[PDB]
Design a binder for this molecule. Structure first.
Ligand code: HEM
Ligand code: HEM
Ligand code: HEM
Ligand SMILES: *[C@@H]1O[C@H](CO)[C@@H](O)[C@H](O)[C@H]1NC(C)=O
Ligand SMILES: *[C@@H]1O[C@H](CO)[C@@H](O)[C@H](O)[C@H]1NC(C)=O
Ligand SMILES: *[C@@H]1O[C@H](CO)[C@@H](O)[C@H](O)[C@H]1NC(C)=O
Ligand SMILES: *[C@@H]1O[C@H](CO)[C@@H](O)[C@H](O)[C@H]1NC(C)=O
Ligand SMILES: *[C@@H]1O[C@H](CO)[C@@H](O)[C@H](O)[C@H]1NC(C)=O
Ligand SMILES: *[C@@H]1O[C@H](CO)[C@@H](O)[C@H](O)[C@H]1NC(C)=O
Ligand SMILES: *[C@@H]1O[C@H](CO)[C@@H](O)[C@H](O)[C@H]1NC(C)=O
Lengths: 681, 681, 197, 49, 144, 49
C-alpha cells in the first residue's frame, strides 16, 4: 500500500491555482513581446521573453548512445525469503522485505522517435533502491549478446546503426553493413538467431523474459562465492507478433509498447516478474561444453535449474517522462555488498563505459544527485564541487586520512561497516595479453541448439526473417559470406535461406551439427497464463441497431478482464473508435458484431467516413496475422466475403455466448500457427 | 534575529559519525586501488577508484568572464519605512520589513587566483531574496563606468586584461593595451581617475561605498515613475591603502580582503550599509549639465541629496565557498514589480549578457534551481526539461492558452496578480540608428570635477598612480596620446605626469577646464566612525620578560574591539605570530613593546629564527606607509633606529596608558598624509 | 528585417539554441558552417577554438593595431546597414496590433481554392485527428472554431465526432478564390525518377 | 505559420509535442493537447488547414 | 633555421588591413548598438550586438584541476644517436634526428592568476610530436 | 623565501615573463634528456622498490 514514488514527492511542483512567474520568482505574463510602438520591433530589455525562450532553446539533452528509444515505470520488489545462505545482499536478506524499483524497457539501434515494433534486441534495465546503495541489473530480453569483448562494441553498433553517409536505414539491421559484420564476426550469429525469432518482435514489454546475460558472483559474509546468472520470468507469459504485422504497426502506432505498459498500470493490471537465478560452483566454469565467462553462451536449465528468489511488480507510472524516465542513468558498475563481477571481457568494459557516457548525457559529474538517480541509503564522502552541485557540505576537512575530521567519514570493508569487498579467493595468473581464450572459439554449436529447440513454425519465422533482411543486402559477396556462416550452423537453414537470395548454398560442413534440444527458448509454442489486458476489436455499424448488442458483447468480455473497443462509422453512443482511426494491429482479436455485414459488402463498405475496404481489411489482416477471429450470428457472411470458412481453428462463428467462450480461450493460444506456410508445401 | 541561511539548511549534508560511501550509496573504502597481485596493475573493474576520481577530475567550472576574483556572505536587509508612494517594491513595502540577502565583492580583471589588493575597479553585487522574486543590484565601488555602449564591453575588457600572446600582466592595467584604449576612447577617463585614487586600492570590502551606476526607474502601483540612482553608504567609513603597501600585501597575503570579511563576521563584528537613493523627475533627465542616461556621469549630491531607504547587515558566512559563493548567478535582469529599466545603452546590453553567460558557467538552463539561486517566493510556469532538471512537474498541460489546465498558471499584469509591468508612460520616437546621442559628447568635465574635489595629497596619489602605470607603457606614441587626453582634463595634471615619463607636456587646452568641486568623493579626508576589527601588531621579544607588558598591552587594546597580534621570535606563551610569519601589511598600527629594542640592534636583529632586519622593517614599513606607530617606555630606542622623531603626527611614545590612548586615536585618522611628499619638491 | 513579432524573436532564439547543441560559441568554425568570404574580428577564445589569431591588439578603437580590423558601413567597406528610412513611434507595449485580429478569413480562402476531392481530404484529416481527442469539451471548442471558418466544414466534421456543431456563424464566410494553393489540380511537368513496381 | 508572436512558440510546440507524462504520441498532432491549443488559439487555424 | 610552429601556420589568421566581420562572414560595424530612437532602447534584432557579446560571454573554459597556473613554449628535440639497442622509440631512432616539441611549466595548487614565485612543486610537461604519434613526458621539478 | 613573497606581489608573472624574454632576446633555454637504465631483476635491489 506504500507508494513506490514516495521519496520523489518532495521535488514535485503543483502549478494549479497559481500565477505565471519567472525562474527567479516574481509574477509575470508571457503572451506578448515588449515592442517599441504598436507595430514595433521587439526590445532587448524584454527579460520575460528571453528567460522563457532560453529555457525552451536548451530543453534537449543528448540521447543514449544505444537504447535511445524506450519507456519505463516505478514498482516494488519483494523477497520470498532470507537468502543469507547464498549472498550478503541486504535486499535479499529477509522474508517479505520490500525494495522500491524502477525499470526501463527499450530497443537498441533506433534513435529517439523510432518505432516500438521494429525488429531488435530489447533492453531490460532494473534498479533496486536498496538500503545499502543502488543495485542495477542492466539486461536484455535475449540471454546472449553479439560480441565477446567490450572493445568491439563500437564496431558492432556502427555496423547495425544507419549508414553514416546518408543515415539509412532507421532502426533496422536489414542492410549491407549489419550483415557484413555478422558474417565477418561469427560470434554474433547466436544473438542474430534470437533477434530473428519472436524475441525480436515481442507483443509487449510485459510479455518479455529478462536476462543479466553475464555470469556474476554472489558472495556471502565469510567471502565464499558462487557463479550466478540473472533471470526475469514474466508472469504475463511470453508472446510475439508476426513481422508483416510488426511493420504495419510501426507506422500505425510507433508508441505501441510504451502505451501498452502505461494503460496496463493505469487500469489496475500491474505487470510482474519473478527474479530467478542459476547457481553453480566456481569449479564449473569450463564444465558444460563452454566457458561461463563467454557472454555469447547461455547455460541450459538441464545443467542448472532456476531458483526463484522474489517477485517484482511495476505499479506506478512516472508523472514527468523526461525528469524520471529520460534522465535515469543505469550502470552495471552499480554494485552492492554481497555481489561481485567476473572476468567476462564484455562485462569488464561496460563498467568503464556506462560511468563515462553519463558525462556526455548530463554534461557534468553530479548526475547521481538527480531525484531519480538518488539512493535511499544516504551519501557520505569527500566528493566536492562539480557542475550543478546541489548540496552544501558541512565537513570542511574533505580528505582522508585526517586528525581534524576525527576519522570521519570512516573506511568500511568486509569485517567493518558492511562495506563492499571483492571476492577474496579471486586470483590473477599468466602473461599480460591482448588475446581471447581458446575456450571462446566455438561460435556455431549454441545457435544450432537454439534453432533445434524451436517449433517447426517458429523455425520458419527465423528463416523468413533472415530471408527478408538478407535480400536487402546489395553486395553479392556479403550474401555469400552470410550463407557460408549459416551453413556452419545448419545446412538446411543455409539451403532454405539461399532459395530467396537466388544463390546456391555451400555443401554440408558437419563440424558443428547436432540434434540436441533445450528447455524454455520457445514462444508460439505455449499458451498464456492469463488473458487479462488483452485487446479485442468489435466491428459494428451505426445503421440498423447493430451497436446495441455490440455493447452487450463488449460488456461481457470486460468481465473476464479484456480491453474492448467498439468500432463504427462515427463516434455514436457506444462507439469507442472510428473505422478511419481503426487498425488490426491494435487488437489481439477481431470480432464482427451481428448486423455489421453491410460494411463489408456493396453499399456501406464505400462510405466517405473511412478509406475504401477498411472494415474488410481489418478482418483480413487479423486472420492473416494469426489472431483469433469471430463473427456473431448473421455476421458469418463477413467471414465468407474475405474467403475464410467457419470450420478452421481460431475462427468462431455462432451465437453471442459461443463466440465469447471461443474468443477468450482463443486468446490463450494467441497466434494460430496453422495459417502460416512451411517450406516444402 | 532570524538566520539568513535558514532556507539553505535542508540541502546541508553532515558526514560526522558516518561510513564512507559512493555517490550512488553503499559503504566503501577508498585508500587502496584494486590490484591484480601484490605488485600488480590496477584493474578496470575497480568502480571505487573511478567514481572517486571522476568527480575529482570534473570539479572545476569556468570562472566569471569578469569579476572572477571575489568573495561574499549572507545577511539581512531592513527597510526604514513604507515606501509605497515612490515604488511598488515589496521589500520596501513596510517599516521594519526584513528580507534575506547575499552580497559578493570582487575585482574586475584578475583571474580566480589573483590578489585582492591589486589596483582595479571593485564589484558590489547585492541580491534581495524578496517575497516577490529575486531583485539584484549588481554594482561597483565607483559611481561611473568606462564605456557608454554595452557593445564596446569586450573591447574594454580585452584591453585591460593580459596581452593574448603571453597572458601578461595579471590583474593590472599597467600595460600598453589598457592605456591605448583609455587614450583612444576618452569616455573611459573618468573611471580611470576613480581607479587611480583610493577607490582602486581600498582597505577592505567593509570600507567601500557602493553604486548601481545606471539610472533606474522607481514605479508606483498607480504607474507613476521617478528616475533613481542606487547608493550603498558604508557604516564602517571609507578607507584605502597606499600603492607601495598594496604591492607588498599582494604577495604577503593575497587573501587579504576575503579573510578580513570572514574574520569580521566570525568575531561578531558584522559590517553594515545604508541603502540610499537620489530621486529625479522625468523632465529633469538632461537638466543638470549632462545626460542621466550616460553611465560615465554621476549626479552631484548638491543637485539631489540621498534619501535613506533601509539598512543591510552581513552576519553569516557560507558553509561551502563553491556551492554558495562561486555558484551564485547575479543578473541586472533580475528585476521585480516596482522597478524598471531606462534607456542607458550600457544597461540595455547587460540585460542580455548576464543571462547568456550563465549557460557558459553552469552548462545548462536550470541554474536558477541551485540552492543559492532559488527564490523564496515560489516558481510556477511552463518551463520543462533542460540539463539537470531538479523537479518533477505535475501539470501535464504545459502551455497557454488552454482549457485542459483551466487557465493555470494564470497571467498577471499591472491590475491582476501583481505582475511585472513596464512604466506605462514610456515611449519611443525617431529613426532606427546605430548611433550615440550628442548629449554624451562631454568626456572631460566630470573627470576634472572629481580631481578638484580631492585633497592635495589625494590628488598626488592619483598622479603618482598614473606615473607608475604610464611608465610601463613601452610605446612612446601611446604615452604621448595619454598626455594629450590628460591635458584636456587638466594642464597641471598633464605636466606633472609628463615629467615622470620624461616627455614635454602639451600646451594648455582650456575648453573643458573649470574650478567646480563636489561633495563626498574623498576618502582620507574623513576619519573613521569606528575602530572595531582594526588590527594592531605588538612587536615584543621572548627575552627579558617583555611578554608580560605585551600581554597587558594586548588585553587593554582588545577591549576597544581591536584584533591584537603579539609578535616574538618564536611562539612562546602569549605569542600569536612569529617575526618570520609577520609583516607590516597585515596591521593597521605597529606598537613596539617595552624591552623589545634588543631585536632592532646587532645581535637580536640577526637571529636564525627570522630574516635579517625583519623587526626593524615592520616598523619602517608601518611608518613609511603612514600608519599610527608607537613605542612603550624604553622602546623609544626602536623608533630612533629608523630615524623617526617621537613627537610628530601619528608617532606616540611614553607609558602604556599614553601609548594605548594615542594609537586608538590615530586609528580613526587611519592614514597620516603629512609623511607623503607633494609635487614641486 | 521587418517588425514581424514572430520574426523578431527568432533572431534571438536560433543563435542561443546553438549553445545547447554544440556546447560552445565556436560552432561557426565548423567546416559546414564556415563562410567562403572570410572572417576578421576581435573574437577570441571559447570552447573548441580552431584558429590562432595573429593580432595581439584585440580591441577597438586602437592606435597599436592602426584601426584594423576596420569598421564597415553603408558608405565604406560594404558593411551591413539597417534601412535608413525605418522608424519607431508610440508607447512601449506588451500587446499585438488591432490589424492582427482576423483569424478566420484566409483559412476559408484556402479551403475555397481547393478542388472538391482535396476539400474532402482536409475534412477527412480533421475527422481522423479530432476523433483521437478524448475530452468532449475540447472537440466542441474545435467545431465552434471550425464553424467560424465554414459551416459546411463544421457540420461535416461534426458527424464523424457524433454530435452537432450546426448553427451558422457567418461573420467570416466568403466565396473568394486564389491561385496555386492546390496540389492535386495540376499535372506533373516531368515523370523522371518516378517509381514503377 | 501558427502563431503571431514568437513568445508563444514554446506553447505551440509543447502542445503538439508528445504528452510530458508518457511521451505519447510520436510525430503527431492527433491528441488532446494539440487540438486544445488550436481551439484556444484561433490564429493557428490557418496553418492547421 | 627550422620553425617549430611550422605545421600550425595553416590555422593562423591575419587581420591586418581587413574590415570587421561577423563569425558567419559579411562586413559590419560593431561600436554602436541598434536603438529605436536617438535616446531609445536597444532592439532585439541587433544581430551584430548579440553575436559579438555571445562570443565574449562564452570565452572562459574550466582551468586545470591542478597545475592551473602555467606557461609554455615551442621547441626542437635532437637525438645524439641511434638508441635502437635500448628502445624502439622512433624519435630516438637515429643521430641528429629532430622532432618538434611543446613544453608547459607550472605550479600545482594555485589557480589561474596566482603568483609564479609561490612555494610549490613545479610542473615540467613535455610533448614529442614524433612520426609515430605524440609522446608525452608529464613530469615535475622534484624527483619524488 | 623573503624574496619570493615580495616578488609574488611585485611581479606575479615573473617566470612566464622570464621564459618569454629569453626566447625573444635570442637566448633560448636548453635541457639534456637523460635516463637511468636498470635491469628487470634489480627492481628491489637498492634498498627500496
Ligand atoms: C550483454 C551485455 C550488454 C547488455 C545486457 C546491455 C544492455 C543495455 C541496456 C538495457 C541499456 C539501456 C539502459 C537503460 O535502460 O537506460 C544499455 C545502454 C548502454 N550500453 Fe549496453 N548492453 C550490453 C553491452 C554493452 C557494451 C559491451 C557496452 C560498451 C562497453 C555498452 C555500452 C552502453 C552504453 C554507453 C549505454 C548508455 C547508458 C546510458 O546512457 O545511461 N553496452 N545497454
Ligand atoms: C554599470 C556598469 C557595470 C557594473 C556596475 C558591473 C558589475 C558587475 C559585477 C559586480 C559583476 C560580478 C557579479 C558577482 O558578484 O558575481 C559583473 C560580472 C559580469 N559582467 Fe558586469 N558590470 C557592468 C558592466 C557590464 C557590461 C556593459 C557588460 C556587457 C554587456 C557586463 C558583463 C558582465 C558579465 C558577462 C559578468 C559575469 C556574470 C556571471 O558570470 O555571473 N558588465 N559585473
Ligand atoms: C606522479 C607524480 C605526478 C606528476 C609528476 C604530475 C604532473 C602533472 C603536470 C605537469 C600537470 C600539468 C600538465 C600541463 O602542463 O598541462 C598535471 C596535471 C594534472 N594531474 Fe598530475 N602529476 C602527478 C600525479 C597525479 C596523480 C596521481 C593524479 C591523479 C590520478 C593526477 C591528476 C592530474 C590531472 C587530472 C591534471 C590536469 C590535466 C589536464 O587538465 O590537462 N596527477 N600533472
Ligand atoms: C577492515 O578494516 C579494519 C580496520 O577498520 C582492519 O583491521 C581489517 O583488517 C580490515 N578487514 C580485512 C579483512 O582486511
Ligand atoms: C549434446 O548433448 C549431449 C547430452 O547427451 C552432450 O553429451 C553433448 O556434448 C551435446 N553436444 C553435442 C554436439 O552432441
Ligand atoms: C491585465 O489583465 C486583465 C485581465 O486579467 C485585463 O483586464 C487588463 O486589461 C490587463 N491590463 C491591465 C493594464 O491591467
Ligand atoms: C574634504 O573635506 C570634507 C570632508 O571632511 C568635505 O566636505 C570636502 O568636500 C572635502 N574637500 C573637497 C575639496 O572636496
Ligand atoms: C560649475 O558650477 C557653476 C555654478 O553652480 C555652474 O553654473 C556651471 O554650470 C558648472 N559647470 C562648469 C564646468 O562651469
Ligand atoms: C474578396 O472577398 C472578400 C470577403 O472577405 C471581400 O472583402 C473582397 O472585396 C473580395 N475581393 C475580391 C474582389 O477579390
Ligand atoms: C647502445 O648503443 C649506443 C651506441 O649506439 C651506446 O652508446 C650505448 O652504450 C648502448 N647502450 C646500452 C645500455 O647498451
Amino acid at each position: 500500500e506504500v507508494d513506490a514514488r514516495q521519496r520523489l514527492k518532495e521535488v514535485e511542483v503543483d502549478d494549479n491555482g497559481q500565477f505565471m512567474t519567472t525562474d527567479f520568482g516574481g509574477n509575470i505574463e508571457e503572451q506578448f513581446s515588449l515592442k517599441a510602438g504598436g507595430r514595433g520591433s521587439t526590445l532587448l530589455e524584454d527579460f520575460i521573453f528571453r528567460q522563457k525562450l532560453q529555457h525552451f532553446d536548451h530543453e534537449r539533452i543528448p540521447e543514449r548512445v544505444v537504447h535511445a528509444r524506450g519507456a519505463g515505470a516505478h514498482g516494488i520488489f519483494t523477497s520470498y525469503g532470507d537468502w543469507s545462505n547464498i549472498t550478503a545482499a541486504s535486499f535479499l536478506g529477509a522474508k517479505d522485505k520490500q525494495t522500491p524499483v524502477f525499470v526501463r524497457f527499450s530497443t537498441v539501434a533506433g534513435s529517439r522517435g523510432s518505432a516500438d515494433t521494429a525488429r531488435d534486441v530489447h533492453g531490460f534495465a532494473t534498479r533496486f533502491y536498496t538500503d545499502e546503495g543502488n543495485f542495477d541489473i542492466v539486461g536484455n530480453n535475449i540471454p546472449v549478446f553479439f560480441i565477446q569483448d567490450a572493445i568491439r562494441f563500437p564496431d558492432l553498433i556502427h555496423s547495425v546503426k544507419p549508414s553514416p553517409d546518408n543515415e539509412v536505414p532507421q532502426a533496422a539491421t536489414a542492410h549491407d553493413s549489419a550483415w557484413d559484420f555478422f558474417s565477418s564476426q561469427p560470434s554474433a550469429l547466436h544473438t542474430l538467431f534470437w533477434a530473428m525469432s519472436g524475441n525480436g518482435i515481442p507483443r509487449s514489454y510485459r510479455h518479455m523474459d529478462g536476462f543479466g546475460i553475464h555470469t556474476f558472483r554472489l558472495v556471502t559474509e565469510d567471502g565464499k562465492s558462487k557463479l550466478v546468472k540473472w533471470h526475469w520470468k514474466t508472469k504475463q507469459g511470453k508472446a510475439a507478433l508476426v513481422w508483416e504485422e510488426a511493420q504495419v504497426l510501426a507506422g500505425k502506432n510507433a508508441d505501441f509498447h510504451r502505451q501498452d505498459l502505461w494503460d496496463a498500470i493505469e487500469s489496475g493490471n500491474a505487470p510482474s516478474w519473478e527474479l530467478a537465478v542459476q547457481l553453480i560452483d566456481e569449479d564449473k566454469a569450463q564444465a558444460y561444453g563452454f566457458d561461463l565467462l563467454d557472454p555469447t553462451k547461455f547455460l541450459p536449465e538441464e545443467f542448472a535449474p532456476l531458483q526463484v528468489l522474489g517477485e517484482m511488480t511495476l505499479n506506478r507510472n512516472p508523472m514527468n517522462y523526461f525528469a524520471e524516465t529520460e534522465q535515469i542513468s543505469f550502470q552495471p558498475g552499480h554494485i552492492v555488498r554481497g555481489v561481485d563481477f567476473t572476468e567476462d571481457p564484455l562485462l569488464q568494459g561496460r563498467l568503464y563505459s556506462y560511468l563515462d557516457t553519463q558525462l556526455n548525457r548530463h554534461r557534468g559529474p553530479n548526475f547521481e544527485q538527480l531525484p531519480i538517480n538518488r539512493p535511499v541509503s544516504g551519501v557520505h564522502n569527500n566528493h566536492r564541487d562539480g557542475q550543478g552541485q546541489a548540496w552544501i557540505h558541512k565537513n570542511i576537512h574533505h580528505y582522508s586520512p585526517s586528525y581534524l575530521n576525527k576519522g570521519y567519514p570512516a573506511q568500511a570493508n568486509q569485517t567493518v561497516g558492511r562495506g563492499f569487498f571483492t571476492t577474496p579467493g579471486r586470483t590473477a595468473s599468466g602473461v599480460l595479453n591482448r588475446e581471447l581464450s581458446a575456450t571462446f572459439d566455438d561460435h556455431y554449436t549454441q545457435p544450432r541448439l537454439f534453432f533445434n529447440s524451436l517449433t517447426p513454425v517458429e523455425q520458419q519465422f527465423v528463416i523468413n526473417a533472415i530471408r527478408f533482411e538478407a535480400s536487402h543486402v546489395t553486395n553479392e559477396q556479403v550474401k555469400k559470406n552470410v550463407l557460408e556462416q549459416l551453413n556452419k550452423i545448419s545446412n538446411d537453414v543455409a539451403k532454405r535461406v539461399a532459395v530467396a537470395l537466388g544463390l546456391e548454398a555451400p555443401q554440408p560442413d558437419p563440424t558443428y551439427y547436432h540434434n540436441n534440444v533445450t528447455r524454455g527458448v520457445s514462444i508460439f509454442n505455449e499458451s498464456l497464463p492469463t488473458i487479462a489486458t488483452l485487446r479485442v476489436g468489435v466491428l459494428s455499424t451505426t445503421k440498423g441497431g447493430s451497436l446495441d448488442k455490440a455493447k452487450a458483447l463488449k460488456e461481457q468480455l470486460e468481465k473476464d478482464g479484456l480491453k474492448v473497443t467498439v468500432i463504427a462509422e462515427y463516434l455514436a453512443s457506444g462507439v469507442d473508435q472510428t473505422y478511419s482511426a481503426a487498425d488490426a494491429t491494435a487488437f489481439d482479436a477481431v470480432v464482427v458484431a451481428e448486423g455489421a455485414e453491410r460494411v463489408f459488402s456493396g453499399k456501406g463498405a464505400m462510405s466517405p467516413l473511412f478509406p475504401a475496404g477498411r472494415p474488410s481489411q481489418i478482418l483480413t489482416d487479423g486472420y492473416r496475422w494469426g489472431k483469433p477471429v469471430a463473427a456473431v450470428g448473421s455476421a458469418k457472411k463477413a467471414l465468407q466475403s474475405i474467403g475464410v470458412e467457419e470450420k478452421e481453428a481460431g475462427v468462431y462463428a455462432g451465437a453471442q455466448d459461443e463466440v465469447i467462450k471461443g474468443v477468450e480461450e482463443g486468446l490463450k493460444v494467441f497466434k494460430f500457427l496453422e495459417r502460416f506456410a512451411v517450406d516444402g508445401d
